[PDB]
Design a protein around this ligand. Structure first.
Ligand SMILES: [Cl-]
Ligand SMILES: [Cl-]
Lengths: 276, 277, 277, 276
């Protein structure tokens, strides 16, 4: 005897967990990203312009910060996320700036990886599809095999029109697994000026890493966030497979070309594929 | 071990209970409100215009259907709700119509009854504040006295300018308690063309009704639960007076008509109009 | 992720909720039963001996206080309960006194009302089956008709031999519903010397009382919750007849005395004695 | 609106989770131990007799199987566990055999590691205290440091009278961690004739192993059980510390003397300490 079904709202009632002490701290986290690094912007703009990208799909746009840059830089952006809770902030921003012609043109919609094909509006499909900030790692492997990772990837891939780009990244889980730590301050896209401590939890199921759970401490309060530990060799194969190997594929480590065995260990691997 | 804290989202992940069978059926419920009845529109519009209301605050605006009407009729509307889940549909609509001047001027924001004074923007406060559709009954009495009902009301009241209206209703809980049924099809504002069954659950705590919970089945057969505080007429009226310090004129309608104690016709909803003096 | 499945124990680990604040206060409640009133003993012993009862089945025996009396008075008692948590105290007692011949002969076993026929050992079935202290009211009506009440009763009935008694009671739910209070200090079997406050919660589903839940505070101030099905007198009586196919004699006591409809004195408990014919 | 507080029972009502599909399968597990191995009995009896043990405390006795043997072999046994749910089976057995003088004399009681000193009845304290079958591993480290392991051990230690034995064991977590598997069929005390599959989950917190969770499949149904991963070097130190190093201490691997670096890898380490 819950008083309302899980997931139903009520006029003038806060949705189920809005008021919780973890939420009102999680919103500090979701919004401490207000400091794009110079090196990131220079790289992304550089790559999209080099390949002649005009219409861009930004998947898992979150508060839309990456999208907002693209809109400002002259691109034709549609931005999607599954989370209403975060999409709300992008939608807000668009609205304040609804008066600027670029922002009138900015398309923001709900979409889920698992049904991406039905969700997104376009015809032709995009010049580039970007999925940056390690968002793909959010997707759990509940099934057991990786049948959800395969389907999500093939849906994102399908968004890429012949000669177009998929630009997608993962935190260096190779390094994470071997040290057993996901330390703070390592975002290459946005730098935080927030002090944090992180507890790293690695879950190994039947001798295969299966989840990395981060317990953040940041006025002092706790939130939890969880990740699928994508290893470089494996993620690469997953990406190829989404295209049927009809793609060229290169690997960056922190925006610079990556060579197996190099001495510098990157915080993130960034995969750029062009559909052939 | 939860893999994420309750109430935290993840880029590219549905928020906690979005895909549950009760949710994707609740959205069917919450978008039934699509057939405003003729005499509702004619009464509301008539009252606002009788008292010269221009600036209107719509509290718990839900998908914003009542607000959308007001904007379409020329009013200066601001619309609030605590539920992001619902405010989503209103914001959507405004966006589609952002091209019509009236909709550019429509203000939509997050607010909670418990902090309404801080939350809403304005100076100095509305011609009329409308809270209709029985939303106030959504607010539970967790603390046990009715201390929360007192504060909410007092906050809504405070939005009302000198000379202004508070327009606020309740389903007829007197009738509900005495027959122990809150049956379907009774909405006087929007008529459903959806078939439903309702189970009605009345909770009495130490001899005072404390909660009415409704378990809907809707016709693909699916279920959801929604809960209410049972505001009786004599009580709610006192509560409303108290929100104004009695410095108000108050009258009671039953289904849009003047209501008289002991009349034979039993109204589905009581609707309270108060003017601040 | 739970670290162990719900309901599995671990060598050297307390079972799931043993150390919770409500448990270690519930045990204070469940061992209040330590002051049998004089007129209870005198009525029970009197009835059993009037009808020549030797072999007795005590159903929901809890800590076994009623059973311990019967054994001490010379009866052939078997005692059952579904709750391991409670059966623990009875088993303990038997063990301490395992040296007295009467206690060597006392049978104590696990049984569930839903399967009572399979569960209890015997051939051919008891002189009297006693289920007293309002335990039957513990059984919820989850399925909605009273199908479970029917089966339980029918199972208990089946334990009764030709010529035998079923002795079974209910707190007076008629009174409870009509005043909306189940107040403390009313036990006619055991008197507490413990101070308590009770909150009474009545759940009505589609116009039929479906549950009474009691939230106790006990005087170190601690809280626990316990729930009951509200058996009304007219109804429970029909249910009991039906368990025997009407092939039974039935009478109703109010607090150990013959009960007559419309009398002025309002009993705390109704106690039903039925003899199989 | 739970209808009754968590952990309260009701005359003629099954305690909270008794009826669950995991429980009625867990009882198959708790009772598939009806086949003591010959080698175990020969070792334990041998050791207790060698040191002249008469009064024995069996901690975490579970269904009492080890205790029942001791009672049958002539010892003065008191047997304790925290779990009513399992203690119930020992108590049962005693009762059926209450007629045999040895079983009249058998003391069975409730006790918790954390308060063992107050819980157990004795004066002098025991000739040997046995905690076998890997039960100590059941005790989680919720605190974070190992302050509960330290207190439990010092309580068990305190049960041992001058010149007496603590005999206590752990599954080989060294091996478990390094292979990432806790496979079935490896009990050296009791052999199962039950077919099982096990999923092994290792949880590493801040680079220190913290939990091993076993999901059993055994008519096919699932239960879960969890363990603290005690490593040999560390557990040894913990045991010494419980005595203040005023103890001699040897290590067996599967009942045979254990030598660091030997080629045979044991399933269990068994610690025998004598208080000096
Ligand atoms: Cl107007
Ligand atoms: Cl007798």
């Amino acid at each position: 005897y819950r008083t309302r079904s899980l997931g139903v709202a009520a006029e003038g009632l806060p949705d189920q967990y809005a008021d919780g002490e973890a939420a009102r701290v999680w919103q500090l986290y979701i919004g401490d990203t207000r400091s794009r690094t110079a090196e990131y912007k220079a790289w992304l703009l550089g790559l999209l312009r080099q390949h002649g990208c005009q219409r861009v799909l930004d998947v898992a746009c979150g508060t839309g910060v990456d999208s907002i840059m693209l809109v400002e830089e002259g691109f034709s952006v549609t931005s999607v996320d599954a989370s209403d809770k975060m999409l709300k902030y992008a939608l807000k921003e668009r609205w304040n700036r609804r008066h600027e012609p670029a922002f009138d043109k900015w398309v923001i919609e709900e979409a889920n990886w698992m049904t991406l094909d039905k969700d997104v509006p376009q015809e032709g499909g995009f010049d580039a599809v970007i999925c940056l900030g390690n968002s793909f790692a959010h997707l759990p492997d509940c099934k057991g095999d990786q049948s959800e990772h395969r389907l999500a990837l093939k849906n994102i891939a399908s968004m890429v029109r012949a000669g177009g780009l998929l630009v997608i990244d993962n935190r260096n889980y190779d390094h994470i697994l071997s040290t057993g730590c996901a330390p703070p301050g390592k975002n290459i896209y946005y730098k935080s000026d927030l002090t944090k401590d992180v507890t790293t939890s690695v879950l190994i199921v039947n001798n295969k890493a299966h989840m990395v759970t981060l317990d953040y401490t940041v006025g002092l309060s706790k939130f939890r966030l969880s990740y699928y530990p994508h290893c470089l060799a494996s993620f690469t194969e997953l990406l190829q497979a989404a295209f049927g190997g009809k793609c060229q594929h290169s690997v960056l480590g922190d925006f610079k070309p990556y060579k197996p065995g190099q001495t510098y260990i990157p915080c993130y691997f960034i995969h750029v594929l062009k559909r052939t």
